Design a protein around this motif. Structure first.
Motif, mmCIF file in Angstrom:
data_model
loop_
_atom_site.group_PDB
_atom_site.id
_atom_site.type_symbol
_atom_site.label_atom_id
_atom_site.label_comp_id
_atom_site.label_asym_id
_atom_site.label_seq_id
_atom_site.Cartn_x
_atom_site.Cartn_y
_atom_site.Cartn_z
ATOM 1 N N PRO A 143 -19.869 76.523 -59.092
ATOM 2 C CA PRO A 143 -18.945 75.807 -59.981
ATOM 3 C C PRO A 143 -17.480 76.052 -59.666
ATOM 4 C CG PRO A 143 -19.793 77.730 -61.094
ATOM 5 C CD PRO A 143 -20.459 77.705 -59.742
ATOM 6 N N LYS A 145 -15.874 74.613 -57.257
ATOM 7 C CA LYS A 145 -15.265 73.435 -56.652
ATOM 8 C C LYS A 145 -15.732 72.131 -57.292
ATOM 9 C CE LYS A 145 -18.403 75.364 -53.600
ATOM 10 N NZ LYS A 145 -18.782 76.798 -53.632
ATOM 11 N N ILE A 146 -16.302 72.180 -58.493
ATOM 12 C CA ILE A 146 -16.582 70.969 -59.266
ATOM 13 C C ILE A 146 -15.322 70.697 -60.080
ATOM 14 C CG2 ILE A 146 -18.077 69.836 -60.919
ATOM 15 C CD1 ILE A 146 -19.984 72.424 -59.989
ATOM 16 N N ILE A 147 -14.410 69.943 -59.502
ATOM 17 C CA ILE A 147 -13.119 69.707 -60.131
ATOM 18 C C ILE A 147 -13.163 68.385 -60.883
ATOM 19 C CG2 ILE A 147 -12.171 70.954 -58.168
ATOM 20 C CD1 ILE A 147 -10.865 67.512 -58.757
ATOM 21 N N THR A 148 -12.557 68.369 -62.065
ATOM 22 C CA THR A 148 -12.582 67.212 -62.946
ATOM 23 C C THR A 148 -11.394 66.306 -62.660
ATOM 24 O OG1 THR A 148 -11.849 66.679 -65.188
ATOM 25 C CG2 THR A 148 -11.923 68.998 -64.560
ATOM 26 N N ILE A 149 -11.641 65.002 -62.689
ATOM 27 C CA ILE A 149 -10.663 63.997 -62.297
ATOM 28 C C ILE A 149 -10.317 63.156 -63.515
ATOM 29 C CG2 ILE A 149 -10.456 61.800 -61.087
ATOM 30 C CD1 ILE A 149 -9.654 64.240 -59.482
ATOM 31 N N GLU A 150 -9.026 62.938 -63.731
ATOM 32 C CA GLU A 150 -8.554 62.042 -64.766
ATOM 33 C C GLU A 150 -7.646 60.996 -64.140
ATOM 34 O OE1 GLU A 150 -6.657 63.899 -68.040
ATOM 35 O OE2 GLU A 150 -8.462 64.926 -68.749
#
Lengths: 155, 95, 66
Positions: A143, A145-150
């Motif tokens: 976890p 490098k599971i980056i959240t994108i907005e």
RNA sequence: UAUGUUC
RNA sequence: CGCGGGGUGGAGCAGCCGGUAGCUCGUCGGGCUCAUAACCCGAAGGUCGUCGGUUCAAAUCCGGCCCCCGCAACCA
RNA sequence: GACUCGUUCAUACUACAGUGGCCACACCAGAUCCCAUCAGAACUCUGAAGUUAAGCACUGUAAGGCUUGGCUAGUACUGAGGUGGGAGACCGCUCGGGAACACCAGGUGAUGAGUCAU
RNA sequence: GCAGAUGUCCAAAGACAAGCUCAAAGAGAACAGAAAUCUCUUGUAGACUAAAAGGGGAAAAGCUUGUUUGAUUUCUAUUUUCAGAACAAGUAGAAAACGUGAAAGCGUGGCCUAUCGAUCCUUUAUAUUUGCAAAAUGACGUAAAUUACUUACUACUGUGCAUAUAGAGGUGUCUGAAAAGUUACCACAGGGAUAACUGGCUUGUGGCUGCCAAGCGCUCCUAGCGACGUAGCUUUUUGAUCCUUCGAUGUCGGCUCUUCCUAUCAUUGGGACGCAGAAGUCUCAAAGUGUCGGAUUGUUCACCCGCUAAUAGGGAACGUGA
RNA sequence: AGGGAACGGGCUUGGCAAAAUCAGCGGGGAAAGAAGACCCUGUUGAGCUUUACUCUAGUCUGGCUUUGUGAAACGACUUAAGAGGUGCUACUUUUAAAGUUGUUUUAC
RNA sequence: AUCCGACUGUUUAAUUAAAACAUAGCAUUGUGAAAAGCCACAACUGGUAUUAACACAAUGUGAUUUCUGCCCAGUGCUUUGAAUGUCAACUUGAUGAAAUUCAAUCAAGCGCAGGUAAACGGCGGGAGUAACUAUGACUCUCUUAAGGUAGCCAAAUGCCUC
RNA sequence: CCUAUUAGCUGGUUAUUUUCGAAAGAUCUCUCAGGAUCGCUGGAGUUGAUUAAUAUAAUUUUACCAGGUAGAGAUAAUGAUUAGAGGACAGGGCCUUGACCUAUUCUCAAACUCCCAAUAGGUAAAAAGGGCGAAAUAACUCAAUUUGUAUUUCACUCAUAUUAAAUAAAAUAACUCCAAGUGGGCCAUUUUUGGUAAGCAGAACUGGCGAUGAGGGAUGCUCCUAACGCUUGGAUAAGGUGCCUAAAUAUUCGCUCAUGAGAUCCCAUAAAAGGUGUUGGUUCAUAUGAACUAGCCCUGAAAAUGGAUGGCGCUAAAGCGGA
RNA sequence: ACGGACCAAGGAGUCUAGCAAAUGUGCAAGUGUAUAUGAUUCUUUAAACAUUUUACGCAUAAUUAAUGUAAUAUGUCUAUUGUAGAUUUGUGCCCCACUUUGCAUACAAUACCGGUAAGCAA
RNA sequence: GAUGUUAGGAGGGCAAAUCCGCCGAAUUUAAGCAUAUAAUUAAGCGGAAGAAAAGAAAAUAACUAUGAUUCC
RNA sequence: GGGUAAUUGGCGCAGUUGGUUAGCGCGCGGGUCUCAUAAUCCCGAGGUCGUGAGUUCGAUCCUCACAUUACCCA
């Protein structure tokens, strides 16, 4: 009103940037045989044997070989039908086509695969695969490098 | 346009080598009255009816094709060699 | 009066109505103007092959028909 | 028996 | 506007048919005459309408502009 | 270490420097001869006294150029759909494709056949 | 449609080979200068290559030199235009004979893209090819025989003409007639495939209305104006187009008569002023009412004389010719 | 009113719309006449004109014929000799008036 | 009073009655005759002509008055020619075996040389210049066959122009 | 009378059903209102296929080609183009003017290009063939009578039982013959030239109209849905559901008051500039003052018969934006 | 935009020549008996029938301006050669892969005939 | 040649389909048009018969040769 | 295309084997004053090329060069 031989070939029949000058001496060493595929690429440095504007970038089979020229059969579209045309060019304007090199490599590779497959009497699928849908993959990811994108605001 | 009087060239008749040739300019020559076309034209022109054939009166071009008569010096046979049309033509002028 | 000079409209569908016909692509092509001193020699080759085959066949036929 | 202005 | 011709000494005109730009009147100087004309002698003055292009060479040849002139602008 | 014939035809070019030579290339000594010019400068011929000064090879430069990658940038542009928005100019959305200049960083070659020297 | 070019030019500006490298700049050298010649350095072509433009070209395709005539004869497979016909212009070759180079090779015109012409007729060349309708013409030529109508064998046979093949003489309206006007005296077949008039789209032009504010207005941008710029409206001008009418929609103006619009000239009621009063100017709601008599001109338009309160602008197939 | 071949009696949406008649009238029926006479096209004409193309009556001129009878002059041809240059001989001038022909004048 | 036509006359029957036509007057041209001028005819023959230059034929202008300027370069028309270039048939000569092919010359015409504008017709442009300004008598220059004369005019002839 | 002259021109050209079904491009033409010829079409016939495969394909995939349009650039070249900054040939009085050079800088090209898409285009993807050998033949080629090349004959064998990539009412194919009509086109999207512009003129692609009706857009040759034998049911497309008019005065959430509101692509016009109308947002100043921003509304906004969101009318919409 | 007030009757791709293609028919390297003849046929009958053992047309051979010349070639009553290809033959009377034969036709190759080039040429 | 109301006779005009002489177009076609074509035609003038006209080689041929004219 | 004639001084001009000759133009001197009149040298591929000929621009020939007639089936 103006339909000369080289009309409209201002850029097509011009040498590339820093690619001027006559052809290399190694071009004269290439082997041509009857019936093999060849590309018609006009070389503006050689004026004799120059193909017509239409045939630059086309491909055809050899039907005739002369001391410094070659005759190649090219399909040209004329309204309602394709028709064969025998274009005679010097060997500077012709180049061994690679349109079937994948076919020849496939032929030799499949031959030497089928040889051993028949030797071991194993039935093998030899046709090309046109690979489509991939199988399910049970993929791991830490976890870190599971980056959240907005969506971004406007600036 | 300037061409010399002589020329070493292939002879195509009666001697199949390269030989010396005298070069001159071919001239049309008069139409003889006994030629079949002339006799037919004169017979047609006789009588009433006026002019019976077209008379060309347009005259577009201003030059003529130059015809060289080549005469082989060894085998005395002549040949014709047409040249591109030109306004000035001299035979054997100074270089 | 003034006429429409040119258009290629409808020409493509006219062409495709009977399809874009392809050349027949025959197996053999005439060698009329191609590589003399090579195709003449090929004629000689074929004559020699035919002569040998025909003489052998004639020998077999004569020896089998007595 | 050429011509030959004005103050 | 469509053309189809021309711009050269101060004026009017040649050379303007590529290389060495002429004539007349005009102007200047000196004579002749008391003086002025006329006359005689000797000089000077042309950047060739303007801008590019061709040519070894352009006032000349080729185009583009600025003026001048001459025709055309008809059927309702 | 080097040479001949090549391939790729700038990572191979250009400028300015440093280093290097035994046969090796070369500069170099001459002009009788073949040959050559105004000029033995060049070309050609005959040599081997001298020299790595140069050519040549290798390297260097916050070098120019070239080359590769990144980034510009899913930007610009664009194929298909739209009874999409907008008065229009133009601009979204859906199914797709996708640059360039510039800038930054690395690099400045590799190789075929044959031969010579040790 | 735009910028141009062609009907030519070249015994070399064609062919081959060799050698060389060009334009330009900088520095230097009596005359000598911005330019005259010479030397060196740099020099990817910034020169040159017949011409228009575009491609190509550096031990070259450029310059110089040497030798030459392949700018030759014959024939194919074909490319361009395209009907996949012709001409023309090319490409790749083959059979001869040559040129050049030491040779590999290159050369069938011009470095490539343009520079050109059917039938019929004429003309001149080529031919061991043919004819001129019962035949002959070199020639009784060569061999034998007698007083003949002898017999055999000869690629080479009169003038003239016609043919076959190949060039040339030309049609530029360039796939190619031998061709001046006028009709306001006019005819016919047609055409709204096409003009002259309405209408229609457009609105450059004409007319009308806005926005900004440099200035004008003694000072003060905006009482009234408003340059430099810029946004619109209208179809009352003239254009542009050719959509409808050419088996016909009567084409100017005036007179007569009605109606409509408002971008209002006067009249009604208002607002502003650079508004003391008078007169006037700008502007709002408003089309109810009214907008004239004459001289000149066919005129519309215009221009004067005069009255008036005012003598406003327009539309209705340029309103209105049974 | 709209759209439409861009000026509808018909079509669409509205206004509306109540028998039969008489007399006027000239807005409309893009009213009637009449295959537009203007304009353009036609490889359709015609009248007219000219230094359009090709011809032609007339007219001018020459030749042959009609066309007979004489004379003279001149010219030319043929023929013999002289002279000039001149390679058996070739050309030029003159001399006769010899035989032949043509022309110009004239006579009946 | 102006324009046009002098007048009397005539005319587009059925859109034009006129300034159009005619006219007298004026001028020009051809012709001396049956071998002439002009004209008709297929030929023969004829009209003028029962004529004869005070005539006939062909034109232009349009009473009278006053006039009718310059240009023969162009195009027409016309006059002379053995000096004269060109040309057809024919003729003559040369050559050839002949057809033929070559030459040579006293036609007309054109060309050459003249005449002719009451024949068709035509009949210029720049500058400078006079004690104020203005204009230009005057001067210079290019140029034609001649450079529009006498007259007349915004004329039924002038665009601009009301 | 020749003469019923000729007419590339106008008008007309006579029963039914069924099936197939165009062109308005192109080349030449004394050609531009015509003709021939090609293309498009019908009829006839053969060869094929009828073996879910081969031929084949307005399609893609895989592999390999060719391009210089859009874009980009102006410091890469050419052609333009605005400014300064620094620095060793000319002019005058160490100074100035410039020129020139260097590194920058603002802005451009249909007839500019270092680079360079998308789309469009071409070739190949095996059996009359390929691979691998031996032997023959030739006058060709080579130094080679045995180098090579080509041909021929023998061998071996290269998936096929899914088919040398995918998909395919692909043989409704290919070919031949005879012949009609056509050779005035126009429109829409996108691209584009001339033009101030045009329902203007000229081009490119595809689809249409023409040649074609049906449902919808009130109306309409070309827009949207959708193309058509005669019927019964069902369910929809486009588009609509206040009445005209079949179907919602449906539900749910906002906006808007117009003393000329607004109301379905084509489509039946509206702009610059403004508003202390109202509704949301954004950034600054201790719930106050500003400056912006964009929804609807308003001004700008004037034409002739009387008048048109199609009409009525509609405001707790029957208007606008959604769901 | 033009023609059509109404009704009846009439009213327009036909005939001949010549060519070709298509299809049907007869015969076939031949086909067509032309003009004309004869025949106890002579209302019909102007049609039917017939033709004493190289008339003529077209075809059977082409090519050349033409004098002209004219199609494997006597080893053999094998009838040119390939690649595909219909049909046939057998082996694994009805599926298929090998054999056998090889129509039509297509694509080529070969000869040979006429003409023209080129070489030689009594 | 004259002249004759001398004797005896003939010609004249109509009619044309076929027939014999003369004269003689243009429409048309050529996609224009002039030679050409229409056409030795139509129109015009004249002259005969039941048929007319042609006809017994100054003819063909080139052959092993035919034998007036006319017509198919 | 046919026939004829012409182009020699800067202008004009005729001339042909034992040949380049001139009037005008040029220059000064001169002249009875300044115009008008004599004089000298300067002025020539005899249009161009070739050809024949002890002895030629010369004789012949062809090329373009101008003016008249006359000719037109490419």
């Amino acid at each position: 009103k103006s339909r000369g031989k080289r009309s409209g070939t201002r850029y097509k029949f011009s040498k590339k940037f820093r690619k001027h000058g006559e052809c290399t001496a190694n071009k004269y060493l290439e082997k041509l045989n009857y019936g093999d595929y060849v590309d018609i690429v006009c070389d503006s440095t050689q004026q004799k044997g120059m193909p017509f504007n239409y045939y630059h970038g086309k491909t055809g089979k050899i039907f005739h070989i002369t001391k410094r020229g070659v005759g190649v059969l090219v399909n040209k579209r004329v309204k309602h039908r394709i028709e064969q045309k025998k274009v005679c060019v010097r060997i500077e304007h012709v180049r061994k086509s690679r349109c079937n090199e994948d076919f020849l490599l496939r032929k030799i590779k499949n031959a030497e695969l089928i040889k051993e497959a028949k030797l071991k009497n194993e039935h093998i699928n030899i046709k090309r695969k046109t690979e489509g849908p991939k199988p399910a993959a049970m993929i791991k990811v830490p976890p870190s490098k599971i980056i959240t994108i907005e969506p971004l605001p406007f600036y | 346009v300037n061409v010399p009087k002589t020329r070493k060239t292939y002879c195509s008749n009666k001697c199949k080598k390269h030989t010396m040739h005298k070069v001159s300019q071919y001239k049309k020559g008069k139409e003889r009255l006994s030629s079949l076309g002339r006799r037919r034209y004169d017979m047609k022109q006789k009588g009433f009816g006026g002019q019976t054939k077209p008379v060309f009166k347009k005259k577009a071009k201003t030059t003529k094709k130059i015809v060289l008569k080549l005469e082989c010096t060894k085998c005395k046979k002549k040949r014709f060699q047409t040249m591109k049309r030109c306004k000035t033509f001299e035979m054997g002028a100074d270089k | 009066a003034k006429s429409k000079n040119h258009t290629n409209h409808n020409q493509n569908r006219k062409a495709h109505k009977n399809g874009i016909k392809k050349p027949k692509k025959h197996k053999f092509m005439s060698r009329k103007g191609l590589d003399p001193n090579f195709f003449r020699n090929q004629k000689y080759c074929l004559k020699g092959i035919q002569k040998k085959k025909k003489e052998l066949k004639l020998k077999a036929k004569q020896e089998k028909n007595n």
